[PDB]
Structure formats: C-alpha cells, structure tokens
Amino acid sequence: SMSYTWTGALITPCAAEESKLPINPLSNSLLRHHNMVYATTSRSASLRQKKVTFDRLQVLDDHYRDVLKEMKAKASTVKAKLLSIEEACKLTPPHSAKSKFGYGAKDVRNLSSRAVNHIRSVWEDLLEDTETPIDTTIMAKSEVFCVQPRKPARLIVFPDLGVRVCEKMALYDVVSTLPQAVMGSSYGFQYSPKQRVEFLVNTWKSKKCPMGFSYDTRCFDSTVTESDIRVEESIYQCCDLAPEARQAIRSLTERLYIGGPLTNSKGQNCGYRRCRASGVLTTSCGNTLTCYLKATAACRAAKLQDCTMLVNGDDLVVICESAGTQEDAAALRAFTEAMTRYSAPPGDPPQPEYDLELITSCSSNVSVAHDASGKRVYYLTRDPTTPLARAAWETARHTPINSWLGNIIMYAPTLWARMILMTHFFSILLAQEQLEKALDCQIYGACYSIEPLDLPQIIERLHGLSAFTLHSYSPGEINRVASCLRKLGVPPLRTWRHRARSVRAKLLSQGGRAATCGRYLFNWAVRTKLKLTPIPAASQLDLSGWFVAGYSGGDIYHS
Ligand SMILES: CC(C)N(c1ccc(Oc2ccccc2)cc1C(=O)O)C(=O)[C@H]1CC[C@H](C)CC1
Numbered sequence: 001s002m003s004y005t006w007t008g009a010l011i012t013p014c015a016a017e018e019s020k021l022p023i024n025p026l027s028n029s030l031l032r033h034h035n036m037v038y039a040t041t042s043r044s045a046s047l048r049q050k051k052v053t054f055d056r057l058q059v060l061d062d063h064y065r066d067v068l069k070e071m072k073a074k075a076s077t078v079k080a081k082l083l084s085i086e087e088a089c090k091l092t093p094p095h096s097a098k099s100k101f102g103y104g105a106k107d108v109r110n111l112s113s114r115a116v117n118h119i120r121s122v123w124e125d126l127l128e129d130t131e132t133p134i135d136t137t138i139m140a141k142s143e144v145f146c147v148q149p150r151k152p153a154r155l156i157v158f159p160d161l162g163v164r165v166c167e168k169m170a171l172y173d174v175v176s177t178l179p180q181a182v183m184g185s186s187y188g189f190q191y192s193p194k195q196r197v198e199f200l201v202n203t204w205k206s207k208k209c210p211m212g213f214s215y216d217t218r219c220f221d222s223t224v225t226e227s228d229i230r231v232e233e234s235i236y237q238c239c240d241l242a243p244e245a246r247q248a249i250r251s252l253t254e255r256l257y258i259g260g261p262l263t264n265s266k267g268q269n270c271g272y273r274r275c276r277a278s279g280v281l282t283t284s285c286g287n288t289l290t291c292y293l294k295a296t297a298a299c300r301a302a303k304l305q306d307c308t309m310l311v312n313g314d315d316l317v318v319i320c321e322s323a324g325t326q327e328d329a330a331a332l333r334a335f336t337e338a339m340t341r342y343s344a345p346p347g348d349p350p351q352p353e354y355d356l357e358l359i360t361s362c363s364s365n366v367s368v369a370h371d372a373s374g375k376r377v378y379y380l381t382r383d384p385t386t387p388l389a390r391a392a393w394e395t396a397r398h399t400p401i402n403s404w405l406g407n408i409i410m411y412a413p414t415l416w417a418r419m420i421l422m423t424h425f426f427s428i429l430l431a432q433e434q435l436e437k438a439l440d441c442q443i444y445g446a447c448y449s450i451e452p453l454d455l456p457q458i459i460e461r462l463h464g465l466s467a468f469t470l471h472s473y474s475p476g477e478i479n480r481v482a483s484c485l486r487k488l489g490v491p492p493l494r495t496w497r498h499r500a501r502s503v504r505a506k507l508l509s510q511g512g513r514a515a516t517c518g519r520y521l522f523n524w525a526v527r528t529k530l531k532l533t534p535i536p537a538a539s540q541l542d543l544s545g546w547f548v549a550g551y552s553g554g555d556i557y558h559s
Pocket residue numbers: 415418419470471472473474478481482485492493524525
C-alpha cells in the first residue's frame with residue numbers, strides 16, 4: 001500500500017517561520033558566512049511529501065522468520081511494568097506541545113485535575129475501543145543546516161499530549177528494556193560515545209581481516225509497513241504484561257502505530273499514513289528492532305560471515321570477516337537486494353570499508369588522537385558543519401533545545417568541540433553572567449537540564465581525563481575540520497586560542513566551579529600546563545540513565 005495518501009490540504013506552519021540566520025554581533029564571531037546557514041520551513045514540505053510517498057514492496061522469506069523467532073524468544077524473558085499516570089506525567093517535557101483538550105505541558109507535570117481526568121478517559125478509551133484510528137497532527141520540522149554544493153524540511157506525525165502520556169503508561173518500560181534484551185550488544189543506545197567507540201574498535205579487532213559498512217535506508221520511516229508494525233507488536237506481546245497494558249499496546253498498534261488520519265495545524269484533513277509515525281513513543285525502539293531484524297536476516301541471505309551489528313533506530317553499521325575485495329562487494333550487493341525485498345531499499349548505495357575511521361554511522365565516525373603520555377586514544381567525532389551551523393543559529397536566537405551543549409557533551413574530545421564550541425560558549429556565558437544557569441538539551445532524544453559549570457565532571461566521567469589533553473589528531477580529521485572552517489568562514493586556530501586564553505583567565509579568577517572549567521576545558525590553550533587530577537565530583541556522578549535507550553520522537557524528559 002501507499003506510505004501516504006494526500007487530500008490536497010497543505011502542511012501548514014503554526015506561526016512565523018525564520019529561514020535565515022539573523023545578523024548578530026555574537027553569531028558573527030563564530031561564523032562569518034551567515035548566508036550559508038538556513039533552517040527548514042513548511043515552504044519545502046511539498047518537496048518532502050513527494051519523496052516519502054510511494055508504494056511499498058515486501059517479500060518475506062525463511063531467514064526473516066527465523067531471526068524473528070530468535071528475537072521473540074529473547075523478548076520472552078521480559079517483564080514490563082506499566083507506569084501510573086503520575087510517573088508518565090513526570091516524564092513529559094515542560095515545553096511539550098499542548099493538548100487540544102484544555103491543558104498543556106505544565107498542567108500534565110503538575111498533575112492538574114483537568115489534565116489527569118482527560119488522560120484517564122483516553123486510557124479507558126484505549127481499553128474499550130480497539131479500532132477507531134487515532135488523530136495525529138503532521139508538521140514540517142524546522143532544522144538548521146549549511147548549504148551544500150538545500151534540504152527540504154522533514155515531517156513529523158504526533159498524536160495529542162493526552163495520547164502521548166498514555167503511550168508512556170503502557171510502553172515506557174517496554175521501549176526502555178526490550179531492545180537491549182532482544183539485540184544485546186547490537187543495541188547502540190546502551191553505549192555512551194566512549195563505549196560506542198570501544199565496542200566498534202574491539203569488534204573491528206576481533207576480526208582476522210575486518211570489513212565494515214554503513215547502510216542508509218532511503219526514508220526508513222516510510223518503508224516501514226503495516227506488517228512490520230504488527231511484527232513489532234508481536235515482539236512486545238512476548239512480554240509479561242498487565243492486562244490493561246496488553247490491551248493498550250494492541251489498541252495503540254491498530255489505532256496509532258500502523259497509521260491513521262493526518263490533520264494540519266489549521267485542523268484540515270491532510271491525508272492518511274500507512275507507515276511509521278516519527279513522533280510516537282515506539283518510534284526509536286520500533287525502528288531499531290525492524291532494522292536489526294531485516295539486516296540480520298539480510299546478512300544470512302548474503303552469506304556475509306561473522307557479522308556484528310550496531311543499530312540505533314534506522315541507523316545501521318555492520319562489521320564482518322572479509323572474504324576478499326570481489327567477494328565482499330558481491331556479498332554487499334546481495335545484502336542490499338535482501339534488504340530491498342524486506343522493504344528497506346538503500347538511499348546511498350553501501351560500499352565496503354576496510355578502514356575503520358572512514359565508516360560513518362550515527363552521523364559519526366571513530367578516529368584517534370593522543371594524550372599527555374603520548375598513547376593513542378580512540379574517540380568519537382563527526383564532520384562539524386551541522387553542529388557549528390546550529391551553534392551559530394542558537395547563538396543568534398533562543399531555542400528550546402541547545403544542541404551546542406549536547407554537542408559539547410557528546411564530542412568533548414574532538415578538536416572542533418574544544419577549540420570552537422567551548423571557547424565560543426564559555427566566553428558568551430561569562431559575559432552575560434549566566435554560567436550558573438541550567439540549559440535544556442537532548443541526548444539520544446531524551447531531554448535533560450544541565451548546568452554548564454558541571455561540564456568538567458560530566459566530561460571526565462564519560463570520556464576520561466584524556467579529553468582535556470588529547471592532541472596530535474589524525475591528518476584526516478585535521479583536513480576535515482580545516483576545510484570546514486574555510487567553508488563556513490570560521491576564525492582560525494590562532495584567533496580561537498587567543499579567545500580561549502582570555503576566557504580561561506577570566507574563569508580562573510572567579511574560582512569555584514568556573515575555575516574548574518578554566519583549568520580543564522582550556523588547558524590546551526596555555527603553554528604552562530596545569531596538572532589535571534581526577535575531579536571528585538566525577539566519582540559521585542550518576543550518569544547511567546543517560547545511555548539506556550533511544551527516545552527520539554518519544555516526547556521524553558528525564559527530570
Ligand atoms: C600540534 C598542535 C599545534 N595542535 C594542533 C593545532 C592545529 C591542528 O589542526 C588544525 C588545522 C586547521 C584548523 C583547525 C585545526 C591540529 C593540532 C593537533 O593537536 O593535531 C594543538 O595543540 C591543538 C590541541 C587541541 C586544541 C583544542 C587545539 C590545539
């Protein structure tokens with residue numbers, strides 16, 4: 001069937017949409033070519049709609065069924081709990097889209113009589129009505145990028161706040177613990193960036209002759225079929241579940257996840273969906289399970305040998321035992337055909353990679369640098385173009401989510417996050433006298449509130465003290481960063497070094513936590529290095545819930 005059907009009504013915005021970067025005195029010091037920076041708007045929605053709309057092809061074989069049963073057996077060990085309204089509400093982000101039933105984010109978290117009473121009625125309804133298609137709103141997502149030698153906005157389909165709270169009640173526990181139980185070490189969201197690298201590097205070394213590749217599925221969400229979603233429900237159903245939760249999953253599956261009507265911001269019937277919705281609680285879990293299933297089965301059809309998968313939603317990377325250049329290329333092609341039959345055709349054709357640093361998964365790649373002692377140290381990085389374009393935009397305008405803070409946390413050891421983002425933002429935060437202020441950001445889709453002053457500890461716990469001393473990066477990483485700077489018009493190292501030394505001095509004079517950031521974060525900038533000993537606060541940090549599972553589109557907030 002058709003991934004989508006359209007009525008003609010347009011996907012409309014719900015206010016004014018900024019497309020260009022504001023000429024700002026502060027954004028200009030970070031990036032000079034402001035015209036290369038842009039944000040998607042509903043004005044490009046038509047272009048997107050045509051790309052995600054198509055008839056899906058699907059043929060299932062014995063390999064698929066086999067892997068499916070393997071997966072179900074493991075799911076069979078699971079015991080999901082079911083959250084009470086109270087907890088599900090606690091999980092709602094303070095700034096999440098309001099409900100059309102008289103209440104909003106704040107009321108939900110505050111457990112207002114009106115919000116809880118409505119939520120209750122939606123839950124009862126999910127228990128009584130097993131059919132009626134649940135209404136969703138479709139919107140053009142606004143995201144920032146740098147022009148290329150432009151991207152049309154992405155679309156998001158999400159149900160009402162009321163319905164979202166119920167999804168949590170019935171599936172929060174499931175989507176937080178079933179992926180790991182079913183896929184084990186292949187589930188990428190259980191790893192912190194450093195743990196992801198270690199898993200990738202060790203996996204790579206465990207091969208006599210390693211061969212690896214990333215697989216890009218062309219619009220993965222639209223390739224998800226009604227069948228894949230029921231197969232996915234079948235996996236969830238192997239769990240021990242409270243009666244009400246079992247019915248909630250059954251009804252939410254037929255009424256929401258397999259598809260339903262599309263309404264715009266004006267309240268107009270836009271069309272219908274018969275593929276994955278991007279703004280539902282099961283999206284990450286669902287996509288990860290389905291990609292792993294098709295991929296694993298695809299590997300068997302292709303005869304790839306000793307495959308180790310690493311899956312994060314629709315993002316996939318496979319590392320296996322080489323069989324030779326020609327044989328690897330043939331196997332890879334066979335893999336792609338198997339995936340195509342399973343309704344997961346490629347966007348970018350896949351290519352075998354014999355160099356670990358050249359494999360990009362989760363928009364990132366593993367690379368290597370050196371610590372003070374001089375020992376090689378592997379770490380996660382990525383092309384900084386987008387991270388930087390967005391740092392510029394968030395500098396010029398107020399945004400709910402600060403990706404820059406999220407990028408500093410996840411890529412702390414990188415040459416670009418240290419030299420550019422830390423310097424730029426600590427300089428700016430000192431000025432505005434807002435170093436104490438907590439900011440929201442996302443990690444694997446879950447929303448968190450973090451104090452910039454804590455970055456030193458956070459970085460030590462997740463990356464180790466070496467994140468403050470890495471130097472001598474790879475020639476490949478250096479060219480990528482440098483050619484990035486030229487493109488966006490970012491000041492060179494010298495300028496940044498001067499700024500960092502000036503910010504570092506200012507941070508050291510304040511003492512307390514600010515001096516902590518001064519000493520650690522900017523030690524790369526001075527010549528007279530300061531001995532960097534373990535930060536006490538790093539040994540008393542609970543950062544486990546940070547890397548448990550994916551939540552993108554889940555409307556998840558970790559208090
Ligand atoms: C060796 C030495 C001088 N050096 C480098 C300076 C420039 C560079 O590569 C470029 C080139 C152009 C633009 C940006 C970086 C790479 C390195 C390195 O450590 O290998 C450093 O000490 C870095 C160490 C990390 C900080 C955070 C910035 C300076």
